[PDB]
Coordinates of N, CA and C and ligand atoms in Angstrom, one line a residue:
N148 N -16.7 26.4 3.5 CA -16.3 25.1 4.2 C -15.0 25.1 4.7
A149 N -14.5 24.1 5.4 CA -13.3 24.1 6.2 C -12.1 23.7 5.2
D150 N -10.8 24.2 5.6 CA -9.5 23.9 5.0 C -9.6 22.3 4.5
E151 N -9.4 22.1 3.2 CA -9.0 20.8 2.6 C -7.9 20.2 2.9
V152 N -7.6 18.8 2.6 CA -6.2 18.1 2.9 C -5.9 17.3 1.7
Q153 N -4.8 17.9 1.1 CA -4.4 17.2 -0.3 C -3.5 16.0 0.4
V154 N -3.8 14.7 0.0 CA -3.4 13.5 0.6 C -2.7 12.9 -0.7
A155 N -1.5 12.5 -0.5 CA -0.8 11.8 -1.4 C -0.8 10.1 -0.7
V156 N -1.5 9.3 -1.4 CA -1.7 7.7 -0.8 C -1.2 6.7 -1.5
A157 N -0.4 6.0 -1.1 CA 0.0 4.8 -1.8 C -1.3 3.8 -2.0
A158 N -0.9 3.5 -3.3 CA -2.1 2.7 -4.0 C -2.8 1.6 -3.1
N159 N -2.0 0.7 -2.3 CA -2.6 -0.2 -1.4 C -3.8 0.5 -0.6
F160 N -3.5 1.6 -0.2 CA -4.5 2.2 0.7 C -5.3 3.0 0.2
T161 N -5.8 2.8 -1.0 CA -6.8 3.6 -1.9 C -8.1 3.2 -1.2
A162 N -8.7 1.9 -1.1 CA -10.1 1.6 -0.7 C -10.0 2.2 0.9
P163 N -9.0 1.7 1.6 CA -9.2 2.4 3.0 C -9.3 3.8 3.1
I164 N -8.5 4.5 2.4 CA -8.8 6.1 2.7 C -9.9 6.5 2.2
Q165 N -10.5 5.7 1.1 CA -11.9 6.4 0.8 C -12.9 6.0 1.8
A166 N -12.9 4.9 2.4 CA -13.8 4.6 3.7 C -13.4 5.7 5.0
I167 N -12.2 5.8 5.1 CA -11.8 7.0 6.1 C -12.2 8.5 5.6
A168 N -12.0 8.9 4.6 CA -12.5 10.1 4.3 C -13.8 10.5 4.4
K169 N -14.8 9.5 4.1 CA -16.2 9.6 4.4 C -16.4 10.0 5.9
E170 N -15.8 9.4 6.9 CA -16.2 9.4 8.1 C -15.6 10.7 8.5
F171 N -14.4 10.7 8.1 CA -13.2 11.9 8.8 C -14.3 13.2 7.8
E172 N -14.5 13.5 6.8 CA -15.7 14.5 6.5 C -16.8 14.8 7.3
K173 N -17.2 13.9 7.6 CA -18.7 13.5 8.4 C -18.4 14.2 9.8
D174 N -17.1 13.8 10.2 CA -16.7 14.2 11.8 C -15.8 15.4 12.1
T175 N -15.2 16.1 11.0 CA -14.5 16.9 11.1 C -14.6 18.2 10.4
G176 N -15.4 17.9 9.3 CA -15.9 18.9 8.3 C -14.8 19.1 7.5
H177 N -13.5 18.8 7.8 CA -12.6 18.8 6.7 C -12.6 17.9 5.5
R178 N -12.6 18.3 4.1 CA -12.4 17.3 3.0 C -11.1 16.9 2.8
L179 N -10.9 15.3 2.6 CA -9.7 14.7 2.3 C -9.8 14.6 0.6
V180 N -9.0 15.3 0.1 CA -8.8 15.0 -1.4 C -7.7 14.2 -1.7
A181 N -7.7 12.9 -2.4 CA -6.8 11.9 -2.3 C -6.3 11.7 -3.7
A182 N -5.1 11.5 -3.9 CA -4.6 10.8 -5.2 C -3.8 9.7 -4.8
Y183 N -3.6 8.5 -6.0 CA -3.5 7.3 -5.6 C -2.3 7.1 -6.5
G184 N -1.5 6.2 -6.1 CA -0.3 5.8 -6.8 C 0.8 5.3 -6.1
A185 N 2.1 5.0 -6.9 CA 3.3 4.6 -6.2 C 3.9 5.5 -5.3
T186 N 4.4 5.0 -4.1 CA 5.1 5.7 -3.2 C 6.3 6.2 -3.9
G187 N 7.3 5.4 -4.8 CA 8.4 6.3 -5.3 C 7.9 7.2 -6.3
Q188 N 6.6 7.3 -6.5 CA 6.0 8.2 -7.9 C 5.8 9.7 -7.1
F189 N 5.2 9.4 -5.9 CA 4.8 10.4 -5.0 C 6.3 11.3 -4.6
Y190 N 7.0 10.6 -4.4 CA 8.5 11.0 -3.9 C 8.9 12.0 -4.8
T191 N 8.9 11.7 -6.0 CA 9.2 12.4 -7.2 C 8.0 13.6 -7.3
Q192 N 6.9 13.5 -7.3 CA 6.2 14.4 -7.4 C 6.1 15.4 -6.0
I193 N 6.5 15.1 -4.8 CA 6.6 16.0 -4.0 C 7.9 16.7 -3.8
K194 N 8.9 16.0 -4.3 CA 10.0 16.7 -4.5 C 10.0 18.0 -5.5
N195 N 9.2 17.9 -6.7 CA 8.9 18.6 -7.8 C 7.9 19.8 -7.2
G196 N 7.3 20.0 -6.1 CA 6.3 21.0 -5.9 C 4.9 20.4 -5.8
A197 N 4.5 19.2 -5.7 CA 3.2 18.8 -5.6 C 2.4 19.5 -4.5
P198 N 1.1 20.0 -4.8 CA 0.8 20.4 -3.5 C 0.3 19.6 -2.2
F199 N 0.8 18.2 -2.4 CA 0.0 17.5 -1.4 C 0.7 17.9 0.0
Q200 N 0.0 17.8 0.8 CA 0.1 18.4 2.4 C 0.2 17.3 3.0
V201 N -0.4 16.1 3.2 CA -0.2 14.5 4.1 C 0.3 13.7 2.8
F202 N 0.9 12.8 3.2 CA 1.8 11.8 2.4 C 1.6 10.3 3.2
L203 N 0.5 9.5 2.6 CA 0.6 8.0 3.4 C 1.3 7.3 2.6
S204 N 2.4 6.8 3.1 CA 3.3 6.1 2.2 C 3.0 4.3 2.6
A205 N 3.5 3.6 1.4 CA 3.5 2.2 1.8 C 4.8 1.6 2.2
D206 N 5.7 2.7 2.6 CA 6.7 2.3 3.5 C 7.1 3.1 4.6
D207 N 8.2 2.9 5.2 CA 9.0 4.1 5.9 C 9.9 4.5 5.6
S208 N 10.9 4.1 4.8 CA 12.2 4.8 4.3 C 11.8 6.0 3.5
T209 N 10.8 5.9 2.5 CA 10.6 7.2 1.8 C 10.4 8.1 2.3
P210 N 9.2 8.2 3.3 CA 8.8 9.4 4.3 C 10.2 9.9 5.2
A211 N 11.0 8.9 5.6 CA 12.1 9.2 6.3 C 13.5 9.9 5.3
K212 N 13.5 9.4 3.8 CA 14.3 9.8 3.1 C 13.7 11.6 2.7
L213 N 12.5 11.8 2.6 CA 11.9 13.0 2.3 C 12.3 14.1 3.7
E214 N 12.3 13.6 5.0 CA 12.5 14.3 6.0 C 14.1 14.6 6.2
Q215 N 15.0 13.8 5.5 CA 16.4 14.2 5.5 C 16.8 14.9 4.3
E216 N 15.9 15.2 3.5 CA 15.7 16.1 2.4 C 15.2 17.5 2.5
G217 N 14.3 17.5 3.6 CA 14.2 18.8 4.1 C 12.4 19.2 3.7
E218 N 11.9 18.1 3.4 CA 10.5 18.1 2.6 C 9.5 17.9 3.5
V219 N 9.8 17.7 5.0 CA 9.0 17.0 5.9 C 8.7 17.9 7.4
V220 N 7.6 17.7 7.9 CA 7.7 18.5 9.3 C 8.3 17.6 10.2
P221 N 9.6 18.1 10.7 CA 10.0 17.0 11.9 C 8.7 17.0 13.0
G222 N 8.9 15.5 13.6 CA 7.9 15.1 14.5 C 6.5 14.6 14.0
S223 N 6.5 14.5 12.8 CA 5.3 14.4 12.2 C 5.1 12.8 11.6
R224 N 6.4 12.2 11.4 CA 6.3 10.9 10.8 C 5.8 9.9 12.0
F225 N 4.8 9.0 11.5 CA 4.3 7.8 12.3 C 4.1 6.7 11.4
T226 N 3.7 5.6 12.2 CA 3.4 4.4 11.6 C 1.7 4.4 11.8
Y227 N 1.1 4.1 10.5 CA -0.5 4.4 10.6 C -1.2 2.9 10.2
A228 N -0.4 2.2 9.4 CA -0.7 0.7 9.1 C 0.6 -0.2 8.9
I229 N 0.4 -1.5 9.2 CA 1.2 -2.5 8.7 C 0.7 -3.6 7.7
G230 N 0.9 -3.7 6.8 CA 0.4 -4.5 5.6 C 0.7 -5.9 5.7
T231 N 0.2 -6.4 4.8 CA 0.8 -8.1 4.5 C 0.7 -8.4 3.2
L232 N 1.4 -9.1 2.6 CA 1.5 -9.5 1.2 C 0.9 -11.0 1.1
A233 N 0.2 -11.1 -0.2 CA -0.2 -12.3 -0.3 C -0.4 -12.7 -1.9
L234 N -0.1 -14.1 -2.4 CA -0.2 -14.6 -3.6 C -1.7 -15.0 -3.6
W235 N -2.1 -14.5 -4.9 CA -3.4 -14.7 -5.3 C -4.0 -14.6 -6.7
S236 N -4.9 -15.6 -7.0 CA -5.9 -15.7 -8.2 C -7.3 -15.3 -7.6
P237 N -8.0 -15.0 -8.7 CA -9.6 -15.2 -8.4 C -10.1 -16.4 -8.7
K238 N -9.4 -17.5 -9.2 CA -9.7 -18.7 -9.6 C -9.3 -19.6 -8.2
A239 N -10.4 -20.3 -7.7 CA -10.3 -21.0 -6.4 C -9.4 -22.4 -6.7
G240 N -8.6 -22.4 -5.4 CA -7.6 -23.4 -5.5 C -6.3 -23.5 -6.2
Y241 N -6.5 -22.6 -7.4 CA -5.2 -22.3 -8.5 C -3.9 -22.1 -7.6
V242 N -4.1 -21.1 -6.7 CA -3.1 -20.8 -5.7 C -3.5 -21.5 -4.4
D243 N -2.8 -22.5 -4.2 CA -2.8 -23.7 -3.0 C -2.5 -22.9 -1.6
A244 N -3.3 -23.5 -0.7 CA -2.9 -22.9 0.8 C -1.6 -23.0 1.5
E245 N -0.6 -23.5 0.8 CA 0.7 -23.5 0.9 C 1.7 -22.7 0.3
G246 N 1.3 -22.3 -1.2 CA 2.0 -21.4 -1.9 C 2.8 -22.3 -2.9
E247 N 2.5 -23.6 -2.9 CA 3.4 -24.4 -3.7 C 3.5 -24.3 -5.4
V248 N 2.3 -23.6 -5.9 CA 2.3 -23.2 -7.1 C 3.2 -22.2 -7.6
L249 N 3.9 -21.5 -6.6 CA 5.3 -20.8 -6.9 C 6.3 -21.9 -7.5
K250 N 6.5 -23.1 -6.7 CA 7.4 -23.9 -6.9 C 7.4 -25.1 -8.0
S251 N 6.1 -25.1 -8.4 CA 5.7 -26.5 -9.2 C 4.6 -25.9 -10.2
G252 N 4.4 -24.5 -10.1 CA 3.3 -24.0 -11.1 C 3.8 -24.3 -12.5
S253 N 2.8 -24.0 -13.6 CA 3.2 -23.7 -14.9 C 2.7 -22.2 -15.6
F254 N 2.6 -21.6 -14.5 CA 2.1 -20.2 -15.1 C 3.2 -19.3 -15.7
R255 N 2.6 -18.3 -16.7 CA 3.6 -17.8 -17.5 C 3.7 -16.3 -17.2
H256 N 3.0 -15.9 -16.4 CA 2.9 -14.6 -15.9 C 2.7 -14.5 -14.4
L257 N 3.4 -13.6 -13.7 CA 3.2 -13.5 -12.3 C 3.3 -12.1 -11.8
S258 N 2.3 -11.4 -11.5 CA 2.1 -10.2 -11.2 C 2.5 -9.5 -10.0
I259 N 3.6 -8.7 -9.8 CA 3.8 -7.7 -9.2 C 4.2 -6.4 -9.3
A260 N 3.9 -5.7 -8.5 CA 4.1 -4.2 -8.5 C 5.6 -3.6 -8.8
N261 N 5.8 -2.8 -9.6 CA 7.1 -2.3 -9.8 C 8.0 -2.2 -8.5
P262 N 8.8 -2.7 -8.3 CA 9.4 -3.0 -6.9 C 10.6 -1.6 -7.0
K263 N 10.8 -1.0 -7.9 CA 11.6 0.2 -7.8 C 10.8 1.6 -7.2
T264 N 9.4 1.5 -7.3 CA 8.5 2.5 -7.0 C 7.4 2.0 -5.9
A265 N 7.1 0.8 -5.9 CA 5.9 0.4 -5.0 C 6.8 -0.5 -4.0
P266 N 6.5 -0.2 -2.7 CA 7.2 -1.0 -1.6 C 6.6 -3.0 -1.4
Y267 N 5.2 -2.9 -1.9 CA 4.5 -4.2 -1.9 C 5.3 -5.1 -3.3
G268 N 5.6 -4.3 -4.0 CA 6.6 -4.8 -5.2 C 7.9 -5.5 -4.7
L269 N 8.5 -4.6 -3.9 CA 9.7 -4.7 -3.2 C 9.5 -5.9 -2.1
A270 N 8.4 -5.9 -1.2 CA 8.4 -7.2 -0.5 C 8.0 -8.4 -1.2
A271 N 7.6 -8.5 -2.6 CA 7.4 -9.6 -3.6 C 8.9 -9.8 -4.0
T272 N 9.5 -9.2 -4.0 CA 10.9 -9.4 -4.9 C 11.9 -10.0 -3.7
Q273 N 11.9 -9.3 -2.3 CA 12.5 -10.0 -0.9 C 12.0 -11.3 -0.7
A274 N 10.4 -11.6 -0.9 CA 10.1 -13.0 -0.8 C 10.7 -13.9 -1.6
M275 N 10.4 -13.4 -3.2 CA 11.2 -14.6 -3.9 C 12.5 -14.9 -3.8
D276 N 13.3 -13.9 -3.3 CA 14.6 -14.0 -2.9 C 14.9 -14.9 -1.9
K277 N 14.4 -14.8 -0.8 CA 14.5 -15.7 0.4 C 13.8 -16.9 0.3
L278 N 12.9 -16.9 -0.9 CA 12.2 -18.4 -0.9 C 13.4 -19.0 -2.1
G279 N 14.2 -18.7 -2.5 CA 15.3 -19.3 -3.2 C 14.9 -19.4 -5.0
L280 N 13.8 -18.6 -5.2 CA 13.3 -18.7 -6.6 C 13.5 -17.5 -7.2
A281 N 14.2 -16.7 -7.0 CA 14.2 -15.4 -8.0 C 14.8 -15.8 -9.6
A282 N 15.8 -16.6 -9.6 CA 16.1 -16.7 -10.8 C 14.9 -17.6 -11.5
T283 N 14.3 -18.4 -10.9 CA 13.5 -19.0 -11.8 C 12.1 -18.1 -12.2
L284 N 11.8 -17.3 -11.1 CA 10.4 -16.4 -11.3 C 10.7 -15.3 -12.0
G285 N 12.1 -14.9 -12.3 CA 12.4 -13.4 -12.7 C 11.6 -13.4 -14.1
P286 N 12.0 -14.3 -15.2 CA 11.3 -14.3 -16.5 C 9.9 -14.1 -16.8
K287 N 9.2 -14.8 -15.6 CA 7.8 -14.7 -15.8 C 6.8 -13.6 -15.2
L288 N 7.9 -12.6 -14.5 CA 7.3 -11.4 -13.9 C 6.5 -10.5 -14.7
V289 N 5.4 -9.6 -14.4 CA 4.8 -8.7 -15.0 C 4.7 -7.5 -14.2
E290 N 5.0 -6.4 -14.1 CA 5.0 -5.3 -13.3 C 4.0 -4.1 -13.6
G291 N 3.1 -3.8 -12.7 CA 2.4 -2.8 -12.7 C 2.9 -1.5 -11.9
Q292 N 2.4 -0.5 -12.4 CA 3.2 0.7 -12.2 C 2.9 1.2 -10.6
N293 N 2.0 0.2 -9.8 CA 1.6 0.3 -8.6 C 1.2 -0.8 -8.2
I294 N 0.6 -1.1 -6.9 CA 0.2 -2.3 -6.5 C -1.3 -2.5 -6.8
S295 N -1.9 -1.4 -7.2 CA -3.3 -1.7 -7.9 C -3.4 -2.2 -9.1
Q296 N -2.4 -1.7 -9.7 CA -2.4 -2.1 -11.3 C -1.8 -3.7 -11.2
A297 N -1.2 -4.1 -10.4 CA -0.6 -5.4 -10.3 C -1.7 -6.4 -10.0
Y298 N -2.4 -6.1 -9.0 CA -3.8 -6.5 -8.7 C -4.9 -6.8 -10.0
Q299 N -5.0 -5.5 -10.8 CA -5.9 -5.6 -11.8 C -5.3 -6.5 -13.0
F300 N -4.1 -6.4 -13.1 CA -3.5 -7.6 -14.3 C -4.2 -8.9 -13.8
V301 N -4.1 -9.3 -12.5 CA -4.6 -10.8 -12.1 C -6.2 -10.7 -12.2
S302 N -6.8 -9.6 -11.7 CA -8.3 -9.5 -11.7 C -9.0 -9.7 -13.1
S303 N -8.0 -9.0 -14.0 CA -8.5 -8.9 -15.5 C -8.1 -10.2 -16.2
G304 N -7.3 -11.1 -15.5 CA -6.7 -12.0 -16.5 C -5.4 -11.8 -17.4
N305 N -4.9 -10.7 -17.1 CA -3.5 -10.5 -17.8 C -2.3 -11.4 -17.1
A306 N -2.7 -11.9 -16.1 CA -1.6 -12.8 -15.5 C -2.5 -13.8 -14.5
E307 N -2.1 -15.0 -14.4 CA -2.5 -16.3 -13.8 C -2.6 -16.0 -12.0
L308 N -1.6 -15.1 -11.8 CA -1.6 -14.9 -10.2 C -0.8 -13.7 -10.0
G309 N -0.9 -13.2 -8.6 CA 0.2 -12.0 -8.4 C 0.3 -11.7 -6.9
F310 N 1.3 -11.2 -6.5 CA 1.7 -10.6 -5.4 C 0.9 -9.4 -5.1
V311 N -0.1 -9.4 -4.4 CA -1.0 -8.5 -4.1 C -1.0 -8.0 -2.7
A312 N -1.5 -6.7 -2.3 CA -1.5 -6.3 -0.9 C -3.0 -7.0 -0.5
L313 N -2.8 -7.2 0.9 CA -3.7 -8.0 1.7 C -5.2 -7.1 1.4
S314 N -4.8 -5.9 1.6 CA -6.0 -5.1 1.8 C -6.8 -5.0 0.4
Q315 N -6.2 -5.5 -0.7 CA -7.5 -5.9 -1.7 C -8.1 -7.0 -2.1
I316 N -8.0 -7.8 -1.1 CA -8.7 -9.2 -1.2 C -9.4 -9.6 0.3
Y317 N -9.1 -8.9 1.2 CA -9.5 -9.2 2.8 C -10.4 -8.2 3.2
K318 N -11.4 -9.0 3.8 CA -12.2 -7.9 4.5 C -12.9 -8.8 5.7
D319 N -13.0 -8.2 6.9 CA -13.7 -8.7 7.9 C -13.4 -10.3 8.4
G320 N -11.9 -10.0 8.7 CA -11.3 -11.3 9.4 C -10.7 -12.3 8.1
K321 N -11.1 -12.2 7.2 CA -11.0 -13.4 5.9 C -10.7 -12.7 4.5
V322 N -9.9 -13.5 3.9 CA -9.6 -13.3 2.3 C -11.0 -13.8 1.9
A323 N -11.5 -12.9 1.0 CA -12.9 -12.6 0.5 C -13.5 -13.3 -0.6
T324 N -12.2 -13.8 -1.6 CA -12.2 -14.2 -2.9 C -11.4 -14.9 -3.3
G325 N -11.5 -15.6 -4.5 CA -10.3 -16.5 -5.0 C -9.8 -17.2 -4.0
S326 N -8.4 -17.2 -4.3 CA -7.5 -18.4 -3.6 C -6.3 -17.6 -3.3
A327 N -5.8 -17.7 -2.0 CA -4.6 -17.0 -1.4 C -3.9 -17.7 -0.6
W328 N -2.5 -17.2 -0.6 CA -1.5 -17.8 0.2 C -0.7 -16.4 0.9
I329 N -1.0 -16.5 2.1 CA -0.4 -15.5 3.1 C 1.2 -15.4 3.0
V330 N 1.7 -14.6 2.6 CA 3.3 -14.7 2.6 C 3.7 -14.5 4.1
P331 N 4.5 -15.5 4.2 CA 4.8 -15.4 5.8 C 6.0 -14.3 5.7
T332 N 5.9 -13.2 6.8 CA 6.6 -12.2 7.2 C 8.2 -12.6 7.1
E333 N 8.9 -13.6 7.7 CA 10.1 -13.8 7.4 C 10.7 -13.9 6.2
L334 N 10.0 -13.7 5.2 CA 10.5 -13.7 4.0 C 10.7 -12.3 3.2
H335 N 10.2 -11.3 3.8 CA 10.3 -9.8 3.4 C 10.7 -9.0 4.5
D336 N 10.9 -7.8 4.2 CA 10.9 -6.7 5.6 C 9.2 -6.6 5.7
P337 N 9.1 -6.3 6.9 CA 7.6 -6.0 7.4 C 7.3 -4.7 6.9
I338 N 5.6 -4.6 6.2 CA 5.3 -3.6 5.2 C 4.8 -2.6 6.4
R339 N 5.9 -1.9 6.8 CA 5.4 -0.7 8.0 C 5.5 0.3 6.9
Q340 N 4.0 1.0 7.0 CA 3.5 2.1 6.2 C 3.5 3.3 7.2
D341 N 4.1 4.3 6.9 CA 4.6 5.6 7.5 C 3.7 6.8 6.9
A342 N 3.0 7.7 7.6 CA 2.8 8.9 7.3 C 3.3 10.2 7.7
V343 N 3.4 11.3 7.2 CA 4.4 12.4 7.2 C 3.5 13.5 6.8
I344 N 3.6 14.5 7.6 CA 3.1 15.8 7.3 C 4.1 16.6 6.4
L345 N 3.9 16.9 5.1 CA 4.7 17.7 4.1 C 4.8 19.2 4.5
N346 N 5.8 19.8 3.9 CA 6.0 21.3 4.1 C 4.7 22.1 4.0
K347 N 4.0 21.8 3.0 CA 2.9 22.6 2.6 C 1.6 22.1 3.5
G348 N 1.6 21.4 4.3 CA 0.8 20.7 5.4 C 1.2 21.3 6.7
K349 N 2.1 21.9 6.8 CA 2.7 22.8 8.2 C 1.7 23.9 8.5
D350 N 1.1 23.8 9.7 CA 0.3 24.9 10.0 C -0.9 24.7 9.1
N351 N -1.5 23.7 8.7 CA -2.8 23.6 7.9 C -3.6 22.6 8.8
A352 N -5.1 22.9 9.0 CA -5.8 22.4 10.0 C -6.4 21.1 9.6
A353 N -6.8 21.0 8.3 CA -7.1 19.5 7.8 C -6.1 18.7 8.2
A354 N -4.8 19.0 7.9 CA -3.5 18.1 8.1 C -3.4 17.6 9.4
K355 N -3.5 18.6 10.3 CA -3.2 18.1 11.6 C -4.7 17.4 12.0
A356 N -5.8 17.6 11.7 CA -6.8 16.9 12.1 C -6.8 15.5 11.3
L357 N -6.1 15.4 10.2 CA -6.1 14.0 9.5 C -5.1 13.1 10.2
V358 N -3.8 13.5 10.5 CA -3.0 12.7 11.1 C -3.7 12.4 12.7
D359 N -4.3 13.2 13.2 CA -4.9 12.9 14.7 C -6.0 12.0 14.6
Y360 N -6.7 12.1 13.0 CA -7.9 11.3 13.0 C -7.2 9.7 12.7
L361 N -6.3 9.6 12.1 CA -5.6 8.3 11.6 C -5.1 7.5 12.7
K362 N -4.9 8.2 13.9 CA -4.7 7.5 15.1 C -5.9 7.3 16.2
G363 N -7.1 7.9 15.7 CA -8.3 7.6 16.3 C -9.0 6.3 16.1
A364 N -10.1 6.2 16.7 CA -10.9 5.0 17.0 C -11.8 4.6 15.6
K365 N -12.4 5.4 15.0 CA -13.1 5.1 13.8 C -12.0 4.7 12.8
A366 N -10.8 5.6 12.6 CA -10.0 5.2 11.5 C -9.3 3.9 12.2
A367 N -8.7 3.5 13.2 CA -8.1 2.3 13.7 C -9.0 1.0 13.4
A368 N -10.4 1.0 13.7 CA -11.2 -0.1 13.5 C -11.3 -0.2 11.7
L369 N -11.3 0.7 10.9 CA -11.5 0.5 9.6 C -10.1 0.0 9.1
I370 N -9.0 0.4 9.5 CA -7.8 -0.2 9.1 C -7.7 -1.5 9.5
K371 N -8.0 -1.8 10.5 CA -8.1 -3.5 11.0 C -8.8 -4.3 10.2
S372 N -10.3 -3.6 9.7 CA -11.2 -4.2 8.8 C -10.3 -4.7 7.4
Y373 N -9.4 -4.1 7.1 CA -8.8 -4.3 5.6 C -7.6 -5.1 6.0
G374 N -7.2 -5.7 6.9 CA -6.0 -6.8 7.2 C -4.8 -6.2 7.7
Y375 N -4.8 -4.8 8.0 CA -3.5 -4.1 8.4 C -3.7 -4.4 10.0
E376 N -2.4 -4.1 10.5 CA -2.2 -4.4 12.0 C -1.7 -3.1 12.8
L377 N -2.2 -2.6 13.7 CA -2.0 -1.3 14.4 C -2.6 -0.1 13.4
Ligands
NH4_507 N1 -5.3 -4.5 -16.2

């Protein structure tokens, strides 16, 4: 069978890439083999020799930092998605339509991803900041090691609500489940998610097919189906 593509995938984009890989494999005959986790954790793994050949980041600074450190194919970095951040519980109406629960709520645990490694976690800390609520919300925070773990804390009842990726609650034009407030962008840095071809993916055929496929129509339609822009 054809060249495989080792892809490091930021946790928010787990479900999206699983769906992309099926059509990608159907369409190119290259196999996408993915690992899922926090962006900063892949920065570490990639610096240490991880076999990954493509890196789908939840930010743009980290693929850019890797390029200025000699780990990236120049000309390879592009934006493949722009995410959105939402406050969310599976309990309906608990997270009101204007996010007033943050200001008046009585919750004890507020799930965010580790903002030192997970950009959807950093967007959460930015928004609390610009919302004027950092000092009051700080003690209630509970950090997952990536945005999938933060979401599971909420989904499992280990916290009353959390800042989750829109990708995890959104399908086909709508939040699908529980209670959400869409964080308005003026509160955090836009979640520009960049891809990059790493040194081990230079002159690999699965890798070029993959970045070209992520810019194609089957890919673009699925990415928009999960609430991402462009
Ligand atoms: N959990």
